[PDB]
Each structure stands twice: as structure tokens, then as C-alpha cells.
């Protein structure tokens, strides 16, 4: 299992990633084989998005550091976080077509702006263009 | 750092020492220096746990007897022939 020194280190790292990123998307990912994950990982690395499954207890500790404390309640059940550290969105986008297509898991709440984002209305982020669209 | 609580023995001999070990204690002795040797009693299982650590035989221990600390080092140990028990310990004044 995981000694206390481990878990402290796991927190620290997830927190440091949280400071650099700009758009966090949280989803259930239970009941999906590793191949489709491995596929989602190549889609995250490609799109510059940081992907982690982490203990809901342990995430609550990372979050509180700022400004995701709205996400607390998203940490009931199996949790997969998505940190778009370079650019915003694209994860929010990516997860939904991946969500729809695979009819396993769901997607919970996203968070931008230090504001929780409701499951349905995430379509906001999941339609925000490129940076690199204002030209 | 190991600290040990001890009591001075009232009487010595084979009969007295066996009654101690039946009462979950065991005798010990403190010699060294110019002072006279001092016969003491020790709680067995409590000391038995401390001697299970390798530093017990290398560092300097303190034995509080009559509320007086004495800095000593473990000199020699008499173990039970076939049981995980202690029969006697020689303490030399540090």
C-alpha cells in the first residue's frame, strides 16, 4: 500500500500541476478497459493535457490549496481529473465525444474561473475555439 | 536513548533470584569505577523489548534507581538456555 510519505508526495505533485493549469475536467472512468485509456492518454499528451486517476480523499487535499474547492463534491465515486496545463479546454471537448462514443462512464463537473461547471452545461468549454481563433 | 527503572535487591542467592524470575523480573548488577557494586532488579518483558534493538548494546543507557540516574553500558547478558528470556545482565558504569 502507500506509506504516509508517499501520499504526501502524491498530493504535492497533483497540487503543483493544479497551479499551472487553467481548465480542470473531472469524470468517472470506471468500466473502461486500459486500451481505451491508453488511447485517451495519447490524446491527452497530444493535446497537452495532464491526466490522473487519484484517490478522492487525496484530491480534496490538493484542491483546497485554491481555486478548485468547488470541485470537492465531484469527489464522490471513481474520479478521473484532466488538467489542460497548456491552452484551456480541449480536454472538456475531448472527454465528451469520448464519453458519448464509449457509453461507459459519465463525466461529472468541470471547473474553470474558480467556478464549478455543471455536467450538462459544460458544452460551453466544449465549444471554446483556439487561441489562435481571435485572428 | 534507553532509560530503565530499577529497584535495589533486598537479598541475593539462588533461592531469591529464582523467585524474581517467577515474578516476571530478573536480577542485574552495576559495577565499574571506584564505587561499590550495586545489585538491582529489572522488569523482564520491558527490558526484553529494549534489548531486541542492536543499539541497546552500543549506546549508553540510564538506569533510574531511587530516583537517581546512572549512565552505564551493557557489558554481558545471561540468556535462558532455550527460552526467549533474560536471566542476568552485567552493567558497567560508563
Amino acid at each position: 500500500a502507500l506509506n504516509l510519505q508517499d501520499k504526501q508526495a502524491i498530493v504535492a505533485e497533483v497540487s503543483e500541476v493544479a497551479k499551472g493549469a487553467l481548465s480542470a475536467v473531472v469524470a468517472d472512468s470506471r468500466g473502461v478497459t486500459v486500451d481505451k485509456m491508453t488511447e485517451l492518454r495519447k490524446a491527452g499528451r497530444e493535446a497537452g493535457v495532464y491526466m490522473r486517476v487519484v484517490r478522492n480523499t487525496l484530491l480534496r487535499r490538493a484542491v483546497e490549496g485554491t481555486p478548485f474547492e468547488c470541485l470537492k463534491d465531484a469527489f464522490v465515486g471513481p474520479t478521473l481529473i484532466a488538467y489542460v496545463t497548456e491552452h484551456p479546454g480541449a480536454a472538456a471537448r475531448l472527454f465528451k465525444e469520448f464519453a458519448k462514443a464509449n457509453a461507459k462512464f459519465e463525466v461529472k463537473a468541470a471547473a474553470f474561473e474558480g467556478e464549478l461547471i455543471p455536467a450538462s452545461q459544460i458544452d460551453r468549454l466544449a465549444t471554446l475555439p483556439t487561441y489562435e481563433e481571435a485572428i | 536513548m534507553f532509560t530503565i527503572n530499577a529497584e535495589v535487591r533486598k537479598e541475593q542467592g539462588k533461592g531469591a533470584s529464582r523467585r524474581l524470575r517467577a515474578a516476571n523480573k530478573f536480577p542485574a548488577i552495576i559495577y565499574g569505577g571506584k564505587e561499590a557494586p550495586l545489585a538491582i532488579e529489572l522488569d523482564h518483558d520491558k527490558v526484553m523489548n529494549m534489548q531486541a534493538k542492536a543499539e541497546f548494546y552500543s549506546e549508553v543507557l540510564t538506569i533510574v534507581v531511587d530516583g537517581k540516574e546512572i549512565k552505564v553500558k551493557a557489558q554481558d547478558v545471561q540468556r535462558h538456555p532455550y527460552k526467549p528470556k533474560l536471566q542476568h545482565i552485567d552493567f558497567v558504569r560508563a
Partner: protein
């Protein structure tokens, strides 16, 4: 659904391919020359792994993958057979460069996020087959 490793512009044989997927409902000649048709571009004598995909109506599709690491490492070491006792008997040398090439091919087929990782996996194979990296 079946997986094979077939020689580039070669297919059909009975002990090799025939029986194997033949006993699943697969049209032999079709796959033979479709396979060869697309594997024409492969270098001569590169054993290539193919995943054959059959459906209830006996019809099928397939994907071609990059050749096995062991194969490329055999060819890169200029040898024919891996060690009988890998890491007890050494049977040759690939430079870090050859590792990297093989890694980029197999990179088209790896799961490594970087060149270094893929290369390390290929090294893992190279170790597994008693080839030293030199």
C-alpha cells in the same frame, strides 16, 4: 478474431497460415493476396504481424502492424536466431542508433511518450534476447 505474424509478400501456406485462421471461417486466397497486396511495400524478408478481424458472415478485415522488436533486433544485429540463453550467452551488437531506428518504427507501434522510453523498451527486448547493445 485472430492474430498472425506473416512474411511480407508471402501468404497461403497450410502449416503456416492455412489451418490457423482457415479453421475460423476465413477465405484463404482473398486474405493471402490482399495481405501481400498491401505488404508489397515492406522490405524483403521482414516478418510483419497482422491482426485478422472476422465477422459472423465469415467476411473479414485486418490491420498490419510494424514488425516484432525481436525481428528488427535480429536483423539489426545481423543474426538469425536470438540467444538460447540470453544474458548468459551474448549474441551481438546494436548501437544506440539502431535501437533508436527500431524504436521509431516500433514508435509507430509503441506506447512511449518519448523516443527515450521507446528506445528503453526496445533495449528491454534486446536484453531479453541476449543481444548486447554495442
Amino acid at each position: 478474431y485472430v492474430k498472425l505474424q506473416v512474411a511480407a509478400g508471402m501468404a497461403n501456406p497450410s502449416p503456416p497460415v492455412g489451418p490457423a485462421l482457415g479453421q475460423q471461417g476465413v477465405n484463404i486466397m482473398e486474405f493471402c493476396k490482399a495481405f501481400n497486396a498491401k505488404t508489397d511495400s515492406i522490405e524483403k524478408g521482414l516478418p510483419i504481424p497482422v491482426v485478422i478481424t472476422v465477422y459472423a458472415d465469415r467476411s473479414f478485415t485486418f490491420v498490419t502492424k510494424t514488425p516484432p522488436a525481436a525481428v528488427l533486433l535480429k536483423k539489426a544485429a545481423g543474426i538469425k536466431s536470438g540467444s538460447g540463453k540470453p544474458n548468459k550467452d551474448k549474441v551481438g551488437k546494436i548501437s544506440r542508433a539502431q535501437l533508436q531506428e527500431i524504436a521509431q518504427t516500433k514508435a509507430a507501434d509503441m506506447t512511449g511518450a518519448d523516443i527515450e522510453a521507446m528506445t528503453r523498451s526496445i533495449e528491454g527486448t534486446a536484453r531479453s534476447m541476449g543481444l548486447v547493445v554495442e
